[PDB]
Ligand binder design. Structure first.
Ligand SMILES: C[C@H](N[C@H](C(=O)O)[C@@H]1CCCN1C(=O)c1ccc(C(=O)O)cc1)C(=O)N1CCC[C@H]1C(=O)O
Ligand SMILES: *[C@@H]1O[C@H](CO[C@@H]2O[C@@H](C)[C@@H](O)[C@@H](O)[C@@H]2O)[C@@H](O)[C@H](O)[C@H]1NC(C)=O
Ligand SMILES: CC(=O)N[C@@H]1[C@@H](O)[C@H](O)[C@@H](CO)O[C@H]1O
Ligand SMILES: CC(=O)N[C@@H]1[C@@H](O)[C@H](O)[C@@H](CO)O[C@H]1O
Ligand SMILES: *[C@@H]1O[C@H](CO)[C@@H](O)[C@H](O)[C@H]1NC(C)=O
Ligand SMILES: *[C@@H]1O[C@H](CO)[C@@H](O)[C@H](O)[C@H]1NC(C)=O
Ligand SMILES: [Cl-]
Ligand SMILES: [Zn+2]
Length: 603
């Protein structure tokens, strides 16, 4: 580690800790910059060489964390809990948690290489018998094929190709991660991840929110199951069991918008999926991003800077190079460079993802003046909610009409139910998977889920929460969790469950602040400068204040609350109950052990 990046002398009291924190944050910018730069170079161009480079940057980061976290331990380990400035307490708390820097060199190197190699296996896996990659080929199959056998072939081929080889690596990663966080005083990695919410009743509150949301999911599930039954027959669909996991329009069954054209109740009304309009008008990736940007600027938030347009990767490179195609947002920590890396396809749900990633960028633009350690969302759920809120407005039929993507819709109940149902497929169907992924990973970190039970515990939670089953037999050689991006990429997941609830609370508050007075699901905050000022206050805070206070200021309440969500979907919730009652559906899947048979002559 460059001497210039090592800590100097500081007094062992609050005033010395303020100086300590300023010199920490100053040198941390350069180290963060070189790390994110090496990751960028790798993720947009996966090679052994770029992997070695990102591992070197990781090692430097770890030496930095060690030098500074040990100094904080030496100076402030006694007293930092007594510091009367709450923000300093937080900055210093964070510095004295060293994470992987608690590891010796040889372990550091093995942790870093584990992360590289897991990343490479996920993003370079392919399904053969020419070869299909996850994005766009398998994604497009899952989304649009209505052939049971072709859907099974992609689902099984992806899970085998990604999950199987990941499993030995994931086990080693888990043990090293846990050894690292345990020396900071956490029971395991999961406990460190949960600490970000600064909330003694975190797990209980989540459980409580889930209980309010579950009836909405169960009604949605049974209505969808009924449509799949008409489309695949009694042999492949059990009206009282879990739904086969490959039939819901997405590799993970994590949101169901892609099968809207199979379940829309009034398919003679104007199609609320504008994909084919975007293709007929000639939309490209760049127009997607420019349309998202203009929404943000209509709110008087910032435009994307030049460095964003010059640096971002907005489409999959044609030049025979391996990339991480999963969409992501990037802050280089230099207050200048911010980019998105997305293999953008022209579809309406991609337009959604574009707003999602740009919400991350906007956050970065809004807090780039803060000292580095405050450059985070108020909690990780806030960072995930920002672009989702704008996408709630963008998706509304009125707004799509404003942007030339739909010829105005008559404002009838049929149009309303069509729209709310499509929104339910996107948001409500996600809720169980958002909740369950970290329940799985917290169990693995805690040791409750050893490697000999990774797949058993995974499908337990998949069936418990989503009510799906694997369409082929799985065993413990399979590692189905590892075929989901965020697992080999070690990105925590509970943020997304938090987000999908928080976004409705934000939306409600923003619509009120824009003076809108219609049904909440028909609000569009476009061009509202007062909504934009209330949003801006959140983004500019970063993590400088507890999320519970930030939320109080914004929404009038200091806790997550499912009510705004329930209010947004109220009409479809009622309609769905009525449909299911009329059809005599059983809610849930009392036939928990059922699996579909294989198709004849598979494969
Ligand atoms: C496509 C969307 N992609 C993710 C994302 O944006 O979240 C990507 C990959 C995981 C993290 N991520 C970031 O881009 C990101 C970058 C930085 C930070 C930070 O500064 O802390 C946070 C996130 C997503 O997975 N999603 C969207 C909602 C559901 C979830 C999924 O598809 O499984
Ligand atoms: C749409 O109409 C609303 C009043 O009508 C109610 O909702 C519509 C969708 C019909 O289903 C009708 O039977 C309902 O009673 C107004 O509140 C609303 O502001 C209108 N929205 C817009 C944007 O025009
Ligand atoms: C190791 C490797 O393949 N990298 C090459 C490098 O040698 C070359 O000079 C430059 C431009 O092609 O980048 C690429
Ligand atoms: C039936 C219904 O929900 N109507 C509402 C009404 O409450 C509101 O005051 C008005 C404002 O646009 O239109 C809408
Ligand atoms: C990808 O990085 C490697 C270095 O390993 C090299 O082939 C080349 O510089 C890069 N390709 C592009 C297009 O940047
Ligand atoms: C798991 O399933 C595959 C394919 O059905 C099979 O080849 C393999 O034997 C299994 N692993 C174990 C331990 O059975
Ligand atoms: Cl999180
Ligand atoms: Zn995100």
């Amino acid at each position: 580690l460059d001497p210039g990046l090592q800590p100097g002398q500081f007094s062992a009291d609050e005033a010395g800790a303020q100086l300590f924190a300023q010199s920490y944050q100053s040198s941390a910018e350069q180290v963060l910059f070189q790390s994110v730069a090496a990751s960028w170079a790798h993720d947009t161009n996966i090679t052994a060489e770029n992997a070695r480079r990102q591992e070197e940057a990781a090692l430097l980061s770890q030496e930095f964390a060690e030098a500074w976290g040990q100094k904080a331990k030496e100076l402030y380990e006694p007293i930092w809990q007594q510091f009367t400035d709450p923000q300093l307490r937080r900055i210093i708390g964070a510095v004295r948690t060293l994470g992987s820097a608690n590891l010796p060199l040889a372990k550091r190197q093995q942790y870093n290489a584990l992360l590289s190699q897991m990343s490479r296996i996920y993003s370079t896996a392919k399904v053969c018998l020419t070869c299909w990659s996850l994005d766009p080929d398998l994604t497009n199959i899952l989304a649009s094929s209505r052939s049971y056998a072709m859907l099974l072939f992609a689902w099984e081929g992806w899970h085998n190709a990604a999950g199987i080889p990941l499993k030995p690596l994931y086990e080693d990663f888990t043990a090293l991660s846990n050894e690292a966080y345990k020396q900071d005083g956490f029971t395991d990695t999961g406990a460190y991840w949960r600490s970000w919410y600064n909330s003694p009743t975190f797990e209980d509150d989540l459980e409580h929110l889930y209980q309010q949301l579950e009836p909405l999911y169960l009604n949605l599930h049974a209505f969808v199951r009924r449509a799949l039954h008409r489309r695949y027959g009694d042999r492949y669909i059990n009206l009282r069991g879990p739904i086969p996991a490959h039939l819901l329009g997405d590799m993970w069954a994590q949101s169901w918008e892609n099968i809207y054209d199979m379940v829309v109740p009034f398919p003679d009304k104007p199609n609320l999926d504008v994909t084919s309009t975007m293709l007929q008008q000639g939309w490209q990736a760049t127009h997607m991003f420019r349309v998202a940007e203009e929404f943000f600027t209509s709110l008087e938030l910032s435009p994307m800077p030049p460095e964003f347009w010059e640096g971002s990767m907005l489409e999959k490179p044609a030049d025979g190079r391996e990339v991480v195609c999963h969409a992501s947002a990037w802050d280089f920590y230099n207050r200048k460079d911010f980019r998105i890396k997305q293999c953008t396809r022209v579809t309406m749900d991609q337009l959604s993802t574009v707003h999602h990633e740009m919400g991350h960028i906007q956050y970065y633009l809004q807090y780039k003046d803060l000292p580095v350690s405050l450059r985070r969302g108020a909690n990780p759920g806030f960072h995930e909610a920002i672009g989702d809120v704008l996408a709630l407005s963008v998706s509304t039929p009125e707004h799509l009409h404003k942007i030339g993507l739909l010829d105005r819709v008559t404002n009838d109940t049929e149009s309303d139910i069509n729209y709310l149902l499509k929104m339910a497929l996107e948001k409500i169907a996600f809720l169980p998977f958002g909740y369950l992924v970290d329940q799985w990973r917290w169990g693995v970190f805690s040791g409750r889920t050893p490697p000999s039970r990774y797949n058993f515990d995974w499908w337990y939670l998949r069936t418990k929460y989503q009510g799906i089953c694997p369409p082929v037999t799985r065993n413990e050689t399979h590692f189905d969790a590892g075929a989901k991006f965020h697992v080999p990429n070690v990105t925590p997941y509970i943020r997304y469950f938090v987000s999908f609830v928080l976004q409705f609370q934000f939306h409600e508050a923003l619509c009120k602040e824009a003076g809108y007075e219609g049904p909440l699901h028909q609000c569009d905050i476009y061009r509202s400068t007062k909504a934009g000022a209330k949003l801006r206050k959140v983004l500019r805070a970063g993590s400088s204040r507890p999320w519970q206070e930030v939320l109080k200021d914004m929404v009038g309440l200091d806790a997550l609350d499912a009510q705004p969500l329930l209010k947004y979907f109220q009409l479809v919730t009622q309609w769905l109950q009525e449909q299911n009652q009329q059809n005599g559906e059983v809610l849930g899947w009392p036939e928990y052990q059922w699996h579909p048979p294989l198709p004849d002559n598979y494969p």
